[PDB]
Protein backbone atom coordinates (compact mmCIF):
# COMPACT_ATOMS: atom_id res chain seq x y z
CA UNK A 1 0.00 0.00 0.00
CA UNK A 2 0.95 3.66 -0.22
CA UNK A 3 2.53 6.01 2.30
CA UNK A 4 0.82 5.91 5.70
CA UNK A 5 0.71 8.47 8.52
CA UNK A 6 -0.08 7.80 12.18
CA UNK A 7 -0.45 11.28 13.67
CA UNK A 8 -3.99 10.72 14.93
CA UNK A 9 -5.53 8.21 17.31
CA UNK A 10 -7.30 5.26 15.74
CA UNK A 11 -10.97 5.99 16.42
CA UNK A 12 -12.48 3.29 14.22
CA UNK A 13 -12.58 0.45 16.73
CA UNK A 14 -16.00 -1.25 16.81
CA UNK A 15 -17.02 1.04 19.70
CA UNK A 16 -16.12 4.66 20.50
CA UNK A 17 -16.04 3.67 24.17
CA UNK A 18 -17.68 4.46 27.48
CA UNK A 19 -18.74 7.90 28.64
CA UNK A 20 -19.18 7.80 32.43
CA UNK A 21 -20.98 10.85 33.81
CA UNK A 22 -20.89 11.32 37.58
CA UNK A 23 -23.51 13.90 38.49
CA UNK A 24 -23.36 14.95 42.13
CA UNK A 25 -26.20 17.30 42.98
CA UNK A 26 -27.20 16.49 46.56
CA UNK A 27 -24.68 16.23 49.35
CA UNK A 28 -24.82 14.77 52.84
CA UNK A 29 -25.97 17.43 55.29
CA UNK A 30 -22.97 16.86 57.56
CA UNK A 31 -20.55 17.95 54.83
CA UNK A 32 -22.15 21.38 54.63
CA UNK A 33 -21.97 21.29 50.83
CA UNK A 34 -24.74 23.08 48.95
CA UNK A 35 -26.98 21.45 46.37
CA UNK A 36 -25.75 22.07 42.85
CA UNK A 37 -28.79 23.51 41.07
CA UNK A 38 -28.35 23.37 37.30
CA UNK A 39 -26.27 20.23 37.28
CA UNK A 40 -29.07 18.00 35.89
CA UNK A 41 -29.19 20.30 32.85
CA UNK A 42 -25.47 19.64 32.41
CA UNK A 43 -25.83 15.87 32.82
CA UNK A 44 -28.66 15.70 30.30
CA UNK A 45 -26.77 17.87 27.81
CA UNK A 46 -23.67 15.68 28.13
CA UNK A 47 -25.67 12.48 27.73
CA UNK A 48 -27.20 13.70 24.48
CA UNK A 49 -23.95 15.18 23.19
CA UNK A 50 -21.91 12.04 23.74
CA UNK A 51 -24.75 9.82 22.52
CA UNK A 52 -24.52 11.63 19.19
CA UNK A 53 -20.76 10.94 19.16
CA UNK A 54 -21.65 7.21 19.55
CA UNK A 55 -20.35 6.78 23.11
CA UNK A 56 -21.95 4.26 25.42
CA UNK A 57 -23.13 6.71 28.08
CA UNK A 58 -23.63 5.72 31.70
CA UNK A 59 -25.12 8.35 33.99
CA UNK A 60 -24.57 8.03 37.74
CA UNK A 61 -26.14 10.34 40.31
CA UNK A 62 -25.20 11.36 43.85
CA UNK A 63 -22.30 8.99 44.51
CA UNK A 64 -20.42 8.80 47.79
CA UNK A 65 -16.64 8.94 47.77
CA UNK A 66 -16.67 5.16 48.24
CA UNK A 67 -19.06 4.66 45.31
CA UNK A 68 -16.96 6.89 43.05
CA UNK A 69 -13.82 4.89 43.74
CA UNK A 70 -15.61 1.53 43.37
CA UNK A 71 -17.20 2.65 40.10
CA UNK A 72 -13.98 3.80 38.52
CA UNK A 73 -12.08 0.72 39.75
CA UNK A 74 -14.76 -1.52 38.21
CA UNK A 75 -14.85 0.42 34.94
CA UNK A 76 -11.04 0.24 34.69
CA UNK A 77 -11.25 -3.54 35.01
CA UNK A 78 -13.64 -3.94 32.08
CA UNK A 79 -12.35 -5.20 28.76
CA UNK A 80 -11.96 -2.08 26.62
CA UNK A 81 -10.21 -3.92 23.76
CA UNK A 82 -12.97 -3.10 21.24
CA UNK A 83 -13.27 0.53 22.35
CA UNK A 84 -11.42 3.50 20.81
CA UNK A 85 -11.31 5.73 23.85
CA UNK A 86 -12.62 6.43 27.34
CA UNK A 87 -14.46 9.47 28.68
CA UNK A 88 -15.24 10.38 32.27
CA UNK A 89 -17.17 13.49 33.22
CA UNK A 90 -17.19 14.71 36.83
CA UNK A 91 -19.83 17.21 37.95
CA UNK A 92 -19.41 18.21 41.58
CA UNK A 93 -17.95 20.45 44.18
CA UNK A 94 -14.19 20.42 44.41
CA UNK A 95 -10.91 22.07 45.28
CA UNK A 96 -7.51 21.91 43.63
CA UNK A 97 -6.84 18.25 42.84
CA UNK A 98 -10.05 17.08 44.51
CA UNK A 99 -13.62 16.14 43.51
CA UNK A 100 -16.46 15.87 46.04
CA UNK A 101 -18.28 12.66 46.69
CA UNK A 102 -21.60 13.25 48.40
CA UNK A 103 -20.03 12.48 51.80
CA UNK A 104 -16.47 13.73 51.34
CA UNK A 105 -13.57 14.23 48.93
CA UNK A 106 -11.83 12.00 46.41
CA UNK A 107 -8.35 12.81 45.06
CA UNK A 108 -8.55 13.17 41.29
CA UNK A 109 -5.26 11.24 41.08
CA UNK A 110 -6.92 8.26 42.78
CA UNK A 111 -9.57 8.18 40.05
CA UNK A 112 -7.24 8.70 37.10
CA UNK A 113 -4.60 6.27 38.38
CA UNK A 114 -6.97 3.36 37.66
CA UNK A 115 -6.59 4.16 33.96
CA UNK A 116 -2.77 4.45 33.86
CA UNK A 117 -1.12 2.76 30.87
CA UNK A 118 0.20 0.00 33.13
CA UNK A 119 -3.04 -0.52 35.11
CA UNK A 120 -5.69 -0.54 32.39
CA UNK A 121 -4.02 -2.47 29.59
CA UNK A 122 -7.00 -2.47 27.22
CA UNK A 123 -6.83 1.35 27.19
CA UNK A 124 -3.05 1.60 26.78
CA UNK A 125 -2.29 3.86 23.81
CA UNK A 126 -5.89 5.09 23.68
CA UNK A 127 -7.12 8.55 24.65
CA UNK A 128 -8.51 8.85 28.16
CA UNK A 129 -10.52 12.04 28.58
CA UNK A 130 -11.49 13.49 31.96
CA UNK A 131 -13.89 16.42 31.83
CA UNK A 132 -14.12 18.16 35.18
CA UNK A 133 -16.76 20.69 36.20
CA UNK A 134 -15.74 21.57 39.76
CA UNK A 135 -14.02 24.33 41.66
CA UNK A 136 -10.23 24.30 41.88
CA UNK A 137 -10.00 26.74 44.77
CA UNK A 138 -11.59 30.04 45.72
CA UNK A 139 -9.96 32.63 43.51
CA UNK A 140 -12.22 34.84 41.40
CA UNK A 141 -11.23 36.23 38.02
CA UNK A 142 -12.12 39.95 37.94
CA UNK A 143 -11.34 40.18 34.24
CA UNK A 144 -10.12 43.14 32.21
CA UNK A 145 -11.94 45.35 29.69
CA UNK A 146 9.07 -0.12 23.44
CA UNK A 147 7.52 1.48 26.51
CA UNK A 148 5.19 4.43 26.90
CA UNK A 149 4.77 6.64 29.96
CA UNK A 150 1.96 5.53 32.30
CA UNK A 151 0.68 9.11 32.34
CA UNK A 152 0.59 9.38 28.53
CA UNK A 153 -2.65 9.66 26.51
CA UNK A 154 -4.66 11.48 29.18
CA UNK A 155 -6.53 14.72 28.52
CA UNK A 156 -7.99 16.74 31.40
CA UNK A 157 -10.54 19.32 30.30
CA UNK A 158 -10.90 21.42 33.44
CA UNK A 159 -13.72 23.93 33.66
CA UNK A 160 -11.52 26.58 35.27
CA UNK A 161 -7.91 27.66 35.88
CA UNK A 162 -5.90 26.22 38.80
CA UNK A 163 -6.86 27.88 42.09
CA UNK A 164 -10.14 29.33 40.84
CA UNK A 165 -13.82 28.91 41.46
CA UNK A 166 -15.90 27.48 38.61
CA UNK A 167 -19.29 28.97 37.74
CA UNK A 168 -22.64 27.21 37.40
CA UNK A 169 -25.97 28.78 36.52
CA UNK A 170 -28.94 27.28 38.37
CA UNK A 171 -31.20 27.61 35.32
CA UNK A 172 -28.87 27.10 32.37
CA UNK A 173 -26.20 24.75 33.75
CA UNK A 174 -22.48 25.37 34.13
CA UNK A 175 -20.76 27.83 31.84
CA UNK A 176 -18.17 25.25 30.85
CA UNK A 177 -20.45 22.29 30.21
CA UNK A 178 -22.96 24.51 28.31
CA UNK A 179 -20.14 25.68 26.12
CA UNK A 180 -18.47 22.28 25.72
CA UNK A 181 -21.66 20.61 24.51
CA UNK A 182 -22.37 23.47 22.11
CA UNK A 183 -18.91 23.25 20.57
CA UNK A 184 -18.97 19.47 20.29
CA UNK A 185 -22.38 19.64 18.61
CA UNK A 186 -21.12 22.21 16.10
CA UNK A 187 -17.57 21.03 15.45
CA UNK A 188 -17.06 17.35 16.36
CA UNK A 189 -17.47 16.32 12.72
CA UNK A 190 -15.08 19.10 11.64
CA UNK A 191 -12.27 19.92 14.09
CA UNK A 192 -9.55 18.21 16.10
CA UNK A 193 -10.43 18.02 19.80
CA UNK A 194 -7.84 20.55 21.04
CA UNK A 195 -9.24 23.07 18.58
CA UNK A 196 -12.78 22.34 19.82
CA UNK A 197 -11.63 22.89 23.40
CA UNK A 198 -9.94 26.15 22.38
CA UNK A 199 -13.31 27.33 21.01
CA UNK A 200 -14.82 26.33 24.36
CA UNK A 201 -12.17 28.46 26.11
CA UNK A 202 -13.14 31.43 23.99
CA UNK A 203 -16.89 30.92 24.47
CA UNK A 204 -16.57 30.74 28.25
CA UNK A 205 -14.16 33.67 28.38
CA UNK A 206 -16.25 35.97 26.18
CA UNK A 207 -19.93 35.10 26.62
CA UNK A 208 -20.27 34.76 30.42
CA UNK A 209 -19.97 37.10 33.38
CA UNK A 210 -21.41 36.54 36.83
CA UNK A 211 -24.29 38.53 38.25
CA UNK A 212 -24.58 38.71 42.02
CA UNK A 213 -26.11 40.94 44.66
CA UNK A 214 -22.89 40.25 46.57
CA UNK A 215 -20.10 42.55 45.37
CA UNK A 216 -17.48 39.90 46.20
CA UNK A 217 -19.00 37.55 43.62
CA UNK A 218 -20.30 40.03 41.07
CA UNK A 219 -18.99 40.65 37.52
CA UNK A 220 -16.53 37.77 37.57
CA UNK A 221 -15.10 35.89 34.59
CA UNK A 222 -13.81 32.38 33.92
CA UNK A 223 -11.27 30.69 31.67
CA UNK A 224 -11.16 26.89 31.39
CA UNK A 225 -7.91 24.97 31.44
CA UNK A 226 -6.97 22.30 28.87
CA UNK A 227 -4.34 19.88 30.22
CA UNK A 228 -3.05 17.51 27.55
CA UNK A 229 -0.75 14.53 27.86
CA UNK A 230 -2.06 13.27 24.52
CA UNK A 231 0.45 11.96 21.98
CA UNK A 232 -1.76 12.15 18.87
CA UNK A 233 -4.49 14.29 17.33
CA UNK A 234 -8.00 13.31 18.38
CA UNK A 235 -10.91 13.40 15.93
CA UNK A 236 -14.26 11.97 16.95
CA UNK A 237 -14.90 10.96 13.36
CA UNK A 238 -12.94 8.60 11.13
CA UNK A 239 -12.56 8.10 7.39
CA UNK A 240 -14.46 5.24 5.74
Amino acid sequence: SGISLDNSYKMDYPEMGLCIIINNKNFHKSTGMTSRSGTDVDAANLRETFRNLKYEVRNKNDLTREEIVELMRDVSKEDHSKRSSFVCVLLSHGEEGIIAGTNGPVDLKKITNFFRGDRCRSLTGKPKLFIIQACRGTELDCGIEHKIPVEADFLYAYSTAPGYYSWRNSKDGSWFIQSLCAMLKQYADKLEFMHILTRVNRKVATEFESFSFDATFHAKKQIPCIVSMLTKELYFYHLH
Binding site: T34, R36, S37, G38, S92, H93, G94, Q133, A134, C135, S159, Y165, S166, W167, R168, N169, S170, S174, S210, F211, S212, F217
Partner: peptide, 4 residues
Protein backbone atom coordinates in the same frame (compact mmCIF):
# COMPACT_ATOMS: atom_id res chain seq x y z
CA UNK B 1 -24.97 32.22 39.00
CA UNK B 2 -23.39 30.02 41.76
CA UNK B 3 -19.82 28.64 42.41
CA UNK B 4 -18.99 24.85 42.59
Amino acid sequence: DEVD
